[PDB]
Symmetry: D2
Subunit: 261 residues, 4 copies
Amino acid sequence: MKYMITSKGDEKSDLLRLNMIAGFGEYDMEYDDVEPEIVISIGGDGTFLSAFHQYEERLDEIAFIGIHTGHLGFYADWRPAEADKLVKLLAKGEYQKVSYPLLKTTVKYGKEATYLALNESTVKSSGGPFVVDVVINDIHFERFRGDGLCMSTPSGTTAYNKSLGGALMHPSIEAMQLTEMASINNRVYRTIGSPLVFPKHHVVSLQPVNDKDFQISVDHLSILHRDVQEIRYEVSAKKIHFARFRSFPFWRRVHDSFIED
Amino acid sequence: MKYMITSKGDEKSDLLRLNMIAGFGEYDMEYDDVEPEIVISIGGDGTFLSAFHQYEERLDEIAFIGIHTGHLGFYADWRPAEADKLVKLLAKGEYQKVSYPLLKTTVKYGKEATYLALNESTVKSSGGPFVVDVVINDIHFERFRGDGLCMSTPSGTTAYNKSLGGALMHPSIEAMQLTEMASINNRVYRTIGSPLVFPKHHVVSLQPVNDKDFQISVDHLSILHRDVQEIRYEVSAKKIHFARFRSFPFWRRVHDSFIED
Amino acid sequence: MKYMITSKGDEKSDLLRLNMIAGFGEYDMEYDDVEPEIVISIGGDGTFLSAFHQYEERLDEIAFIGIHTGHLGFYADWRPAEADKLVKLLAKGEYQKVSYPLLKTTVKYGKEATYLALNESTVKSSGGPFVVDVVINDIHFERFRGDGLCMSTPSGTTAYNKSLGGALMHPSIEAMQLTEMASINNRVYRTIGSPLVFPKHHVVSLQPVNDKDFQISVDHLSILHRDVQEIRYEVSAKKIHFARFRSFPFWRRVHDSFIED
Amino acid sequence: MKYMITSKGDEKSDLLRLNMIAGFGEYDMEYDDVEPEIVISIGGDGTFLSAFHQYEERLDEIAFIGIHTGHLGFYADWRPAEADKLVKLLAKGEYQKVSYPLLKTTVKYGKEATYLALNESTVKSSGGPFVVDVVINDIHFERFRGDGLCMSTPSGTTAYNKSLGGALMHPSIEAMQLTEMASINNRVYRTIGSPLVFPKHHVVSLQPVNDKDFQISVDHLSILHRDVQEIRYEVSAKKIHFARFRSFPFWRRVHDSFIED
Ligand SMILES: CC(=O)NCCCN(CC#Cc1nc2c(N)ncnc2n1[C@@H]1O[C@H](CO)[C@@H](O)[C@H]1O)C[C@H]1O[C@@H](n2cnc3c(N)ncnc32)[C@H](O)[C@@H]1O
Ligand SMILES: CC(=O)NCCCN(CC#Cc1nc2c(N)ncnc2n1[C@@H]1O[C@H](CO)[C@@H](O)[C@H]1O)C[C@H]1O[C@@H](n2cnc3c(N)ncnc32)[C@H](O)[C@@H]1O
Ligand SMILES: CC(=O)NCCCN(CC#Cc1nc2c(N)ncnc2n1[C@@H]1O[C@H](CO)[C@@H](O)[C@H]1O)C[C@H]1O[C@@H](n2cnc3c(N)ncnc32)[C@H](O)[C@@H]1O
Ligand SMILES: CC(=O)NCCCN(CC#Cc1nc2c(N)ncnc2n1[C@@H]1O[C@H](CO)[C@@H](O)[C@H]1O)C[C@H]1O[C@@H](n2cnc3c(N)ncnc32)[C@H](O)[C@@H]1O
């Protein structure tokens, strides 16, 4: 059907993209970057993140594919030299689709705004001290003082979450995971410390204690939100779909990225 | 129906048990510690652990209830003074049952043996160096050198898992979590470090590299296994059932145990 | 001799300060906030930090004293009700002086600027990715990618350093300690991870890899430095002096602040 | 003067040792494994540890040297191919000596026994629960419940201490560092968590709460001590001496062992 290709913009990526476009022309494959059904990303995990967000409004009508021109990525897990074999199988079809959970973030003001994260959503302070009350399903759980908090999808657990001490979880688990950034713990101030892993339908809510200005990030983009009253996290009802041509198990991707390849 | 009561054996616990037995006599409640349908545990989490294991062969035909005569427990989350109101509702019935996942451990020799964990199963060395190959769904993931490994149920994540840096996960998630004990990491030796959270049907397998003698624990009991060829972990097909009379959310139990009460 | 008193500015602190000033008047004690020999700080650790920095140019000619009107502080470790007994002993004198090491930070441009930290000096990115080469005594040790780095005095180790996983060290040790904030570690990127504790005369130097704009903090104040070529850390030749009237061991202050009081 | 050589016992090590012995014969170098002044260790850090302990009673009268026939060691930091150049300089002399602090452990009964550690001394339980009161300079600091405690020399901080989260400290710092193994922390039980770094002359003392049987290790050897009343740690008055022929800075050894080589 219809397809498009994003590129990191370096010479490798642009040239591989132009080459793939020519291969597609040799099939009944029409390039449409408006309503594609296949989105190919050429570059790294960042390039793939950008492609996801470019088309987050047609997630149900798209299967994504990642080609890494640099080191192996977690989302771009196909090698540039397999590119021709890829165009081939994309044309004849018959591939299976694989779905990863996403994270929904809602920001309320005194008005609302929602975002969808593939990696994670984080909250920090606009400079001043970061103090937030953490409420779980309307139960006040803790008062967090520190640098910030990170809420991660399953596939995001090998990203920022990992650097904060979070657990890696298999993407077939419909869950989200909360980790702390440098929490203060003394006689006066008390956080759980451990990461927290939440199931579908649980709502984690952050509420300001003094300052109501926070730097909120969603994947690679950071927005300053003024006069904030609440930040709601929950596992999204929407999912991202991957075109899969081949067995490449998550734990193998983990081993290849972190242990040895 | 039929019921039984275990006690920690201190005076508080024995006396509360004898008192509850008298209250049950005032209903059509017959004490049977052979095929009970209700198992009451009076004491702490250890006492409850012992009660689970005493009756692990009739898990489908039993609902458990925990009374803590000391500090609040995670499994024994009812207070001693609510004991009379408890006997009451146990008799009239109409309570709901709540189910937590369990962990299945298989130990192979050169013969087999399986165990069921409510908290966690751990592996350490019989003194010598602990070196094990970790295989995930038949894929060699890492060679672990260190003090040992811990595999935890969801409800076990607030126990040993927590002290090892693991994430706390809500018990409605059918999963198991692997954490490291003091792994060596240098130029030569490489582990993931992060905890790992596995879904149902995944099989984590530990295989010896030199020494084949390990100290294996399952909840509060530690068995020395000689001439071991494999230790298989997976989320069990069996589940533990709790009689629930009242809303006491897991995250509240967490907040009460660790943040403040 | 000459003395001055800073206050947090709340009613407790101002009133205690005015009361102490009256007690001093009853001795040969002259209030001079220009060249004091005794600096009293009334409030919390922040108030004390501000007092240290107000007079960092006469550190050799001053003995500091902290009064906490809130919870116990690490620098303000005297209780408000002992205030009269304090004025007493300050007048008759004969107290001993205690000295804690400080941290020297030098920032070079393309010009120079040095700062003195009592708690710690940190470095983060002006938004973009934080990538810095870490050089120890001119030997390239690691390329750090992550949120930032923290360099701590001994007395600072119970502050930000503690929240980052650093070790607590007794203030009689002339050293500084470097900790990581969320470092990325994968096949491509490699940091030591462990905190590092440096002796006197060692020079840790941070050098930019791409972006040369960093947010640099020294205790409670954060400065944006543009066109930065180097940040040099070393244990300072200058030390802070405390008037001591009483044995209050560091490890007891630690136990009281973090374990129980 | 007099010298001796230990070997790991594999063919590489034995053959290199016999070769070095022949080179020494070509000088006024007499082999004496009773009162040597130079102790050469051929193998790995374990082999070197064994050599230190073989001669711990003549530490003031010996300079140690490590040759690694496997990967680089922290104590055996000379390569096998530099062996001839080594025998050379050992004969003509004029080398400088470098000294690392050691750890003194005293075990009291109801009688006494002291040990000297180059890496670290650890304490665990004989199976039952490990509960110990930690007293610092006679001040009760904390009640530790968990798997055990580790007390490390500076040069030991890259060994077991490192795997437990401890800080790496430069060996010129006369100090010792205490780290926790899986401590329980909840409403009831409270430890500091952070590693602790102690200066010379401080005494950390462990005292039993119930069980008085512990597995105590000193470097590579583990002794079961029954009816124990106290374990005292302090920085030793004795130091280990290294023959140094060449600049090989500690932080470079760290970088080479852990970052890349
Ligand atoms: C300041 C800065 O770094 N700007 C962001 C530029 C990169 N991007 C793109 C990416 C990605 C990605 N996605 C994945 C993935 N899903 N799984 C595994 N690796 C992945 N990666 C790998 O992350 C490594 C570091 O760029 C690269 O090698 C990628 O292969 C934003 C993502 O950065 C993550 N992050 C931000 N502060 C972090 C920190 N302090 N520590 C660790 N992670 C951090 C965050 O997650 C965000 O979503
Ligand atoms: C040597 C020794 O301790 N012998 C075991 C005696 C206790 N038992 C009974 C229990 C329990 C329990 N079950 C739960 C639960 N599910 N959730 C939360 N708390 C719970 N608890 C609480 O654990 C605290 C410590 O006893 C108590 O206060 C309980 O309220 C064995 C259980 O000990 C756990 N463990 C063993 N080494 C540990 C360590 N180093 N660190 C932390 N945990 C450790 C392990 O899990 C085992 O399954
Ligand atoms: C954003 C923000 O917090 N603004 C700073 C306002 C406070 N100030 C004053 C203080 C202090 C202090 N000095 C000591 C001391 N020497 N020892 C022990 N406690 C101490 N305290 C205690 O720190 C607790 C938290 O304010 C209070 O309870 C004090 O009793 C700046 C100091 O904040 C430290 N910090 C900054 N991000 C931190 C983090 N994420 N985590 C932990 N620490 C962090 C940093 O060290 C700086 O130097
Ligand atoms: C059960 C077992 O392992 N038996 C001990 C056999 C090894 N020996 C010899 C050694 C050594 C050594 N000394 C140094 C040194 N000073 N600096 C850096 N590396 C060093 N190494 C390196 O340690 C790596 C692991 O053998 C090797 O690669 C060596 O190059 C005992 C030493 O093991 C240490 N340990 C014990 N449980 C540990 C754990 N769980 N995690 C990390 N460390 C652990 C402990 O320190 C003891 O003192």
